[PDB]
C-alpha cells in the first residue's frame, strides 16, 4: 500500500553503516573498567543513567529510515545477547559493527556476499570450538567473587555479596535483586517457608513487641478449600486443645462463623491459634499447600482428588512445626516435622517438572518452590541515595548475577577481550574453500581484536599497540586496563564467562554477516 | 467520482515501464547462486532480509501512479507464480520485464498490439510443449536432494534434510516448516497418531521422569459426546478392571462426577486410567475420532447416526493400542490393533474425499488425517541465531519444499535458465500468420535468454557471452555460475522443476503481453 | 616538550597510514629496532634505510619542524578570536 523509496548498492550500504556506526559509537563508550555512562531522556520523569550496552542500544532510533535499519539490526544483536546470556551486550555491539564495516568494505562486483557469510560463520564455529577448549570450570567461591566483581565494573563489594549469597543459597539458588532504601547494599537470606500472607484477624497477636504471633511446637492444619463453618473447625481445635499445642490454620480463607469461633476462643480462654490465607493464585496455590504438607508432615484437606474432609481430622493428619512466626504481611514456618524421604521425593518431582517446562514463568515458580523446600532464597537490596543511582547500580548487580550464573554453567576464560585474541591462531590454520570464504575468515580474524582495542581505547591508551603486545606475550598475560599494566589475567581475577563471550560473538556474526549480503534496501516514504 | 488524469501513448507507456523496471531491477539482484539480498523496512520492528522475488515485489509501491500501475502488474506476475508454483518468482519477474520492454519498443502506428499478444501466447504455448518434451521424471532420492539444494541457494544440508523427510514420510507426505530454537536445522518425524490434547488432570501421571502417563497394551474408549455422569463411565472401568488392562478415554471432555471417579480410582486402588480431550473443532473432531476408532479397532460412542451409548459397553467395542504416551500438551497412540482392511478402506475414503474438494484448508486437514493413518508427518525446525536469519532461511526451506513437490509432480529440466535456452529452436520452426504475430514470436525468442543472462550477470561475468557459448554447446552443457564453469548440468545436479519454469513463463507472458496492448492510462489525481 | 615528543611520530605514522597499514604499530616496531632500520612503505618491509636509499635532506626536515612548531605553538596561545561579520 504505502509508497516506498528504494536504493541500491553502495549508497544504501553506506547509509546503513552510518546507522550502525552511530549506535555502536554510543554503546562503545561504556566498555570496560574505564567506560563512561550514557544518559537517556525519559518522557515521564528523571533521565536514566546507564553503563548497560543493550539499554543504550534500545534507546536509540534514527529519523533516516536507512540509518534506522542498521540501528535496528544492531539493536537485535544487543537484545539477543542480553536474552541469551545477560551480559556482554556492549561486546556484541562492537563485534557486530566491526563485522558489518569489514563486510561492506569487501563488496565488489565479483564478490559473493552470501559465500562470504558462509566463511564468516565457519570462522565463528572454529572460534567457538577454540573458546570451549580454552574454558576452565569454576571451582572456588573466590572465582565466583572475581567473575561478579568484573561484571559489576570492578565493584568488589557487589562481587562479595553475590558470592556470599551463592554460598548461602547455593550456586543454583534463587537470588533476586530489588530496590534498597538505605545507602549501602544488604543481603537478606529467607530460610524455611515464608510466604506473603499474614494473619486474617489482628486478634491473634501474642507478641506485641513486633506485632506478631509466635508459636513453638505447633500443629498445622492445611485446607485447600475455605473454612467458614463451625463443624469444619471444631474437631481440629479439639485436637489442639486436648494435646495442649498451638494450631496454625493455612486455608484459602477463614471467614464468618469459623473466624468468629477462632477469635472467641483466642480472647476468652486463651486458645493458641492463628489463621493464615494460602498463598498463590490457581494451581500454584494447591502446589504450595501440598509442599507445605510434605514439609510439615501433614495432609491437605478439602482437595479435589482424594476428598479429605475437615470434619474427620486425626492428630496424624496435622503437620508439626518447631516454629511459626506470623506478621501482618507474611507468614513463616521453621523446622517442620515432615519425612525426609517425602521431601526429597517432592524435590525430585519439582526437578522433573522443571525439565519439561519452557514457559519462563512457571520455571520461576518451580524454582521458588524448590528453594523453599531445600535452601531458602536470597534477596540483594541495592542501596543508594537517589532512584537514578539505585537503578544504575541495579543494572550492574543484575549483570554480575547473570555473569556469575553463566560462569557456573559453562566455565570461565580470560577477560579483557584476551579470550577472543587467543583464538586467532585457530583461524590461521583454516583452509578456505574459495576466495569469498577466505574473505569471511579474514573478516572474523580482524574482528577478534576489537573488544581488547575498545577496552584499551576507553582507557585512553593506543589500543592497537596494546593488542600487539598482548599477542606477542605468553598466553596467560593480558592487559589490566584499570591498572594500566600487563598482568597474569587469571591471577588478577580479570576473567569472563565462556558463555558470554561465545554468545556475543555468535549473535554479532549472524546478524551482521546477514546485513552484509544486502544489495537493495526498501523503506517507506516518510509522511 | 474522483478527478482523473489521462495519459496517451508513448509517455504513458514509458512511465509504466519505469515502474516495471524499478521493481524488476530490485528483484533481479536476488537471482541465481550469486544473487544478493534485499532488506525491507517493517513498521512494527526489525527489518526483513529476503532473497525471495515475490517478497521483494510485493513490498514495493511507488508514489507516481503511472509507475505504480506497472509495478502492480509485475507484482501480479510474481504473486501468481508464487501461488501456483511456490518458486521461480524472480525468473517470472525478469521474464515479464523483458516482454514488457520488448513489446513497448515494437509499438508503432501500423502495429497491432493485440495481434502481437496473440503471437506472444502462441510462442509461449510452443515453448511449454518443448519444455514438456524436454522434461524427465524424478526417479531417485538423489535428484530430490539436488532439486531441493538448488532451490535452497546451494545449501546441501537443506536439500539433504528435505530428501530425508521425503524418504521417511513419502514423496507426497505432510512436511511442515517451523521456527527452531537452536543454531542448526532438525528433522522431527511424528509417527503413529499424535494430537495436541494432554491429560485432563495431572493425577494420571505414572512416570515422573517426563511427567507423562505411559501405558502398554491399553484399551481405548472413544466418546463423541462428553462424559460427565457416573453410569456412563462405570462399565468401561469394570471391563478394564476385570481384564487387568489400562484404559485411555478420548472424549470431548471428561468432567465432574466421571472425572472425580477416574481420579479416585487412580489414586486409591491404583487403577490404570487416563483421560484425554478429543482434538478438532467440529466435523474434523468426529472425523479424527472415527479415524482413531478405525486405527485402534474400537467403536465411537455418543454419535449422532448410530446412537451407541456408554452405558452398554462390550470389550469388543474398545480399541486396543500397543503403546500410549500422554504428556501435558499432547497424546500419542502407537500400534493400534485395528483391522488392516478397515484402515485401508478409510484411507481410500479420505483419498476420494480429497479428490472432490477444493477449499485448500480442509484439504490440509484431510492430508493430516491421511498421514496420521498411513505414514506420520515431518517437521523441519529451522535453526539460526536471530529471528531475521531464521525468517530468511525459512523462506529458502519453503522454496526448496515447493520446488521438490513440483519436481515430484511434473519432472525436471536443466537449471541455469538452460531449459528455456534449448526451446529457442522450437520457436525458429514456427510460421507466423502475419507480421504482428511474427513480432510477438520474436519478443518471446529474445526473452528466452533473459534468465541465463541474469544469473550470469549477477555472478559478475558478461551474460551475453555466456549465453552464446551455451547455445553453441551440446544440449547437456550449461553454465555453473557458482563455480564459473561450463558443465554437464544434470551430472552436477543443477536442475529445475519443469512446473516452475513453465509457470513462470506463462504467468509473465500473459500479464506483460496484455500490458503492451495499452494506448491510454487513467489514474486518479493525488489528493 | 611532551607535545613535541608526541608530534615527532606523526610523519612516519602518516606515511604508513597512506600505505594502508596501521601506523602506530609500524612506528612502535621502528622505535624498537636498531637505529639504521626503518619502514620501506613502498615495499612494505623493514629495511636498512641508507642502503635502500630512503633518505631525506637534513635542511628539509629541520625546516619543516621549525616552521610548523612556530606558527602552531603561537596559535595555541589564543583565548579570543575576532572576525568580521560576513556581508
Ligand atoms: N581491569 C580490566 N582490565 C581489562 N579488561 C577488563 C577489566 N575489567 C573488566 N574488563 C573487561 O571488560 C569487559 C566488560 O565490559 P562491559 O561490561 O562494559 O561490557 P559488556 O559486558 O560487553 O556489556 P554490558 O555490560 O553492557 O551488557 C569484559 O570483557 C571484561 O573482561
Ligand atoms: N550453480 C548454478 N549455476 C547456474 N544456475 C544456477 C545455479 N544454482 C541455481 N541456479 C539457477 O538459479 C535459478 C534460481 O534462482 P532464484 O531461486 O534466486 O530465483 P527464482 O527461483 O526465479 O525465484 P524465487 O526463489 O525468488 O521464488 C534457477 O534457474 C536455478 O537453476
Ligand atoms: K558496558
Ligand atoms: K531470488
Ligand atoms: Mg558487562
Ligand atoms: Mg528460487
UniProtKB/Swiss-Prot annotation, chain C:
Membrane-spanning segments: none
Position of the Glycyl lysine isopeptide (Lys-Gly) (interchain with G-Cter in SUMO2) cross-link: 87
User: List-wise, which residues carry N6-acetyllysine?
Assistant: 5, 17
Instruction: List each coiled-coil range.
Output: none
Record-listed ATP binding positions: 56
Carrying Phosphoserine, the residues are 24
Entry-annotated residues carrying N6-succinyllysine: 17
The subcellular location is:
Mitochondrion matrix
**Subunit comment for this entry?**
Homoheptamer arranged in a ring structure. The functional units of these chaperonins consist of heptameric rings of the large subunit Hsp60, which function as a back-to-back double ring. Interacts with 2 heptameric Hsp10 rings to form the symmetrical football complex. Interacts with HRAS. Interacts with ATAD3A. Interacts with ETFBKMT and EEF1AKMT3. Interacts with MFHAS1. (Microbial infection) Interacts with hepatitis B virus/HBV protein X.
Query: What family does this belong to?
Result: Belongs to the chaperonin (HSP60) family.
Q: What does this protein do?
A: Chaperonin implicated in mitochondrial protein import and macromolecular assembly. Together with Hsp10, facilitates the correct folding of imported proteins. May also prevent misfolding and promote the refolding and proper assembly of unfolded polypeptides generated under stress conditions in the mitochondrial matrix. The functional units of these chaperonins consist of heptameric rings of the large subunit Hsp60, which function as a back-to-back double ring.
What is this protein's name? 60 kDa heat shock protein, mitochondrial
Its source organism is Homo sapiens (Human)
Q: Which portion of the entire protein is included?
A: 465 to 551 of 573
